[PDB]
Design a protein around this ligand. Structure first.
Ligand SMILES: [Mg+2]
Ligand SMILES: [Mg+2]
Ligand SMILES: [Mg+2]
Ligand SMILES: [Mg+2]
Ligand SMILES: [Mg+2]
Ligand SMILES: [Mg+2]
Ligand SMILES: [Mg+2]
Ligand SMILES: [Mg+2]
Ligand SMILES: [Mg+2]
Ligand SMILES: [Mg+2]
Ligand SMILES: [Mg+2]
Ligand SMILES: [Mg+2]
Ligand SMILES: [Mg+2]
Ligand SMILES: [Zn+2]
Lengths: 56, 251, 233, 68, 121
RNA sequence: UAUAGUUUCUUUACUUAUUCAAUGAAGCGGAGCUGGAAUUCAUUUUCCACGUUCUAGCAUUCAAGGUCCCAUUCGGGGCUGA
RNA sequence: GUCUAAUUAAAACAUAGCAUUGCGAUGGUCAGAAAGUGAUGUUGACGCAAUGUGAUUUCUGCCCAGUGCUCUGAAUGUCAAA
């Protein structure tokens, strides 16, 4: 019950991963992958435009 | 005589709406700066059912541009919208289902819904299941847009007014019979107390103008003037015609 | 230097939560602020009738500094110097038996509205100063016409608070010199010559011209655009 | 004295100056509350005609009442 | 001159200097004595046979107590008047509108030995 | 038929009265920089935009950087970035 | 399914279905002594409000002269105060 979470230790309420006691392991995996790939594609969208502007 | 049932609903005691299980008002996002200069992106998190309403609602999450915060908004879901869909709202947004473009920036024939009749009212025309507004034309000078509403009326409204592109979901709801007083009872258990309906001609004349008589009969004409008063308006108010509709409305 | 980098943030529409900008133009001000601003707006969008805007033309700051320099030589007596004056007079009443004329004749600026109107009507006033910031303006709207009828030079000057500082009050709303010393009558004449040119000699033409009729920025621009879109050929 | 001029001027309510000034004051008094303290009287001649004196313990309230 | 920069469109009432009172004269001119002292929280004992059985067996004194007194006050008043350490206090409001306190003392003291010192047994 | 004047009505315009609505009153109006179209008949007329659209991620510490001061020290302030 | 608690439980009421009527919000229906006041409305024509008939099947014929309702407004019609 909610108030009983104040009587127990931190180890009983989290796991040792990022977003540990809030998000699932596979959801964390998904958002890691999404972040990495979307930032790489942001770089790519940037250099495409940097190519087009130097061209024209 | 006695105060009649239609007079008695205005006091709003047992006739008020039952709004316990309603998720909130289905409003468009406030028209702040981004929706009139560019676009803002939000995301559909869930499509939920709203009590008292056939159309489903979409919980769309946008970001606050001025504070670190995650303001949520309640849209009426358009048919074809799904969870994890990116909604784009504003002037320079793309003509796709679920986007909140202005009406000036859409072509003619476009099907929209939840249309502001005045910019900033955050949701009006075409809000119910299966309903949509059609754009007909533009007056770019005298910046205005003519639209066909679901009633058949034509309306001139500002081009800066907004609308959600697509059709309101839940269409086809009134095609199914209820078959049961109980199904109607549960329909109106969550809307308001307007059911069951006793016929005025089944009443005493103290309770209703049509009441009384040794046969059930209205006696005088059920067509009531618009300049009648409360207590007289029980029948067909300001009826231009009457009877079975034989042909085109000619509108 | 190798540890620091350039992040720069894109404060475009759908990016990068906006920074703290000066929203001094968008404040929800208190109602007294809005009253005192929209009042001065409304008093110039309306066609002001010439008896008002008889004001709105005030003494230039240079000749105003000069006339206040003059008037500050003729200032009333404070409580302290009045008290020692009357101690001297009580001493003299006993020892010299003067007829209350042991003290000399005073030369002081005449103030008070009912006093000064009477001075003007009796033509004892040499110069009159009139404040523009009077909140019931009907207290002073008649004073230019009266000074003109009786031949008195008047000057509408900025600051009833300045007149009050001049005369040991907070506000005075009017001031007047009726008698001046010979050391300064020449400057008084030099001053009246400059003032009558600006106020009394222009009375008959500023009595014709209605004030106000002034527009805001967003409306004057909409009028100018319409004009220069109409005046092309 | 000035109070005589004030008295004869307040009687010219349809003159341009006074109808302009009415036009402005009716707005400023409509923006304030139905009952509000006035620092000083708008019509001091009238006030002292009616008994007002500019000493401590005399107070001016301005009040608007609905018409009809 | 220039004007102040304001990063919010909201105007708040400024914080002004709040004075404290040091006024001119007192409100009631004499501080009232203690409305509830040890001789008013403990009115008298209770000598029912039921209560005297609690004295011999449980080391429990049974007192009549002011309806305004709480357990802190009862404990403090017992420690003051009878020079005894207290373990627990239990209170009830009787059907006659008075308050009854069961005071359990520590094992060092004997309610039986201090009751006949109070003058009842 | 045209007048200098008085006078009613119709149509239209203004905004400050009044009215409506919204907002934690956040980006209005005008002008200017920059790009594109642009035809220029001298030299520039204007008109369009003037950071975000494969992805159910993230976006917060007067912003990092740049530059000038103080009094170096722990650091602090201003302008720009905007 | 519902009702005349304490003489009437029914063929009465309701019902699903059917049809009509008004209303695109400066709105329709209703309330309130008033109001910077309200219910419908956390609503928006697949909605709200007002009526009638009363599952299904098969049909719902003629009459707009009368009373009503509604629509039109150039008028030797009438038509109040100002
Ligand atoms: Mg664990
Ligand atoms: Mg019911
Ligand atoms: Mg009956
Ligand atoms: Mg009747
Ligand atoms: Mg009948
Ligand atoms: Mg009957
Ligand atoms: Mg208890
Ligand atoms: Mg705003
Ligand atoms: Mg019975
Ligand atoms: Mg029976
Ligand atoms: Mg029946
Ligand atoms: Mg309404
Ligand atoms: Mg008449
Ligand atoms: Zn998960």
């Amino acid at each position: 019950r909610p108030r009983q979470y104040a009587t127990v230790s931190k180890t009983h309420k989290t796991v040792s991963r990022a977003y540990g006691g809030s998000r699932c392991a596979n959801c964390v995996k998904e958002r890691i992958i999404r972040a990495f790939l979307i930032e790489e594609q942001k770089i790519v969208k940037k250099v495409v435009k940097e190519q087009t502007e130097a061209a024209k | 005589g006695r105060v009649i049932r239609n007079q008695r609903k205005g006091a709003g005691s047992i006739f008020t709406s039952h709004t316990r299980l309603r998720q909130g008002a289905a409003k468009l996002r406030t028209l702040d700066y981004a929706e009139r200069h560019g676009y803002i992106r939000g995301i559909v998190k869930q499509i939920v059912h709203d009590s008292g309403r056939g159309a489903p609602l979409a919980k769309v999450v946008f970001r606050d541009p001025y504070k670190y915060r995650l303001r949520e908004e309640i849209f009426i879901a358009n048919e074809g919208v799904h969870t994890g869909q990116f909604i784009y709202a504003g002037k320079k947004a793309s003509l796709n289902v679920g986007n909140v473009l202005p009406l000036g920036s859409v072509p003619e024939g476009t099907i929209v819904s939840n249309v502001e009749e005045k910019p900033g009212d955050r949701g009006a025309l075409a809000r119910a299941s299966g309903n949509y507004v059609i754009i007909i034309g533009h007056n770019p000078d005298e910046n205005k847009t003519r639209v066909r509403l679901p009633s058949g009326a034509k309306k001139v409204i500002s081009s800066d007014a907004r609308g959600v592109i697509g059709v309101i979901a839940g269409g086809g709801r009134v095609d199914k019979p209820l078959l049961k007083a109980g199904r109607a009872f549960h329909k109106y258990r969550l809307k308001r107390n307007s059911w069951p309906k006793t016929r005025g001609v089944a009443m005493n004349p103290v309770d209703h103008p049509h009441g009384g008589g040794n046969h059930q009969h209205i006696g005088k004409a059920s067509t009531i003037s618009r300049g009648a008063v409360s207590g007289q308006k029980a029948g067909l108010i300001a009826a231009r015609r009457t009877g079975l509709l034989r042909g085109s409305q000619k509108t | 230097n190798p540890l620091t980098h350039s992040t720069p943030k894109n404060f475009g529409i759908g990016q990068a939560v906006q920074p703290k900008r000066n929203l001094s133009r968008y404040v929800k001000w208190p109602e007294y602020v809005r009253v005192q601003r929209q009042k001065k707006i409304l008093s110039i969008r309306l066609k002001v009738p010439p008896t008002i805007a008889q004001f709105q033309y005030t003494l230039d700051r240079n000749t105003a500094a000069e006339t206040f320099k003059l008037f500050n030589k003729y200032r009333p007596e404070t409580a302290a110097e009045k008290k020692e004056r009357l101690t001297k007079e009580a001493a003299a009443v006993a020892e010299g038996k003067s007829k209350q004329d042991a003290s000399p004749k005073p030369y002081a600026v005449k103030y008070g509205l009912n006093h000064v109107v009477a001075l003007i009507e009796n033509k004892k006033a040499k110069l009159v100063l009139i404040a523009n910031d009077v909140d019931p303006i009907e207290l002073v709207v008649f004073l230019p016409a009266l000074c003109k009828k009786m031949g008195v030079p008047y000057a509408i000057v900025k600051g009833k608070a300045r007149l009050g500082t001049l005369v040991n009050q907070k506000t005075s709303a009017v001031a007047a010199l009726t008698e001046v010393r010979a050391e300064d009558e020449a400057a008084l004449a030099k001053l009246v010559s400059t003032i009558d040119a600006n106020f009394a000699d222009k009375y008959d033409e500023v009595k014709k011209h209605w004030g106000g009729g002034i527009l805001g920025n967003k409306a004057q621009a909409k009028m100018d655009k319409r004009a220069k879109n109409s005046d092309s050929a | 004295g000035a109070y005589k001029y004030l008295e004869e001027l307040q009687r010219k309510k349809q003159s341009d100056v006074l109808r302009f000034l009415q036009r402005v004051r009716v707005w400023e008094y409509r923006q304030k509350n139905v009952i509000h303290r006035a620092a000083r009287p708008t019509r001091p001649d009238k006030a002292r005609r009616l008994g007002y004196k500019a000493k401590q313990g005399f107070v001016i309230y301005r009040v608007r009442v609905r018409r009809g | 001159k220039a004007l102040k920069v304001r990063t919010s469109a909201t105007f708040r009432l400024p914080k002004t200097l709040k004075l404290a009172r040091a006024p001119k004269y007192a409100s009631k001119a004499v501080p009232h004595y203690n409305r509830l002292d040890s001789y008013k929280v403990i009115e008298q004992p209770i000598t029912s046979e039921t209560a005297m059985k609690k004295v011999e067996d449980g080391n429990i004194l049974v007192f009549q107590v002011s309806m305004k007194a709480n357990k802190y006050q009862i404990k403090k008043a017992v420690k003051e008047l009878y020079e005894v350490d207290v373990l627990k206090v239990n209170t009830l409001v009787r059907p006659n509108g008075t308050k009854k306190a069961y005071v359990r003392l520590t094992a060092d003291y004997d309610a039986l030995d201090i009751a006949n010192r109070i003058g009842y047994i």
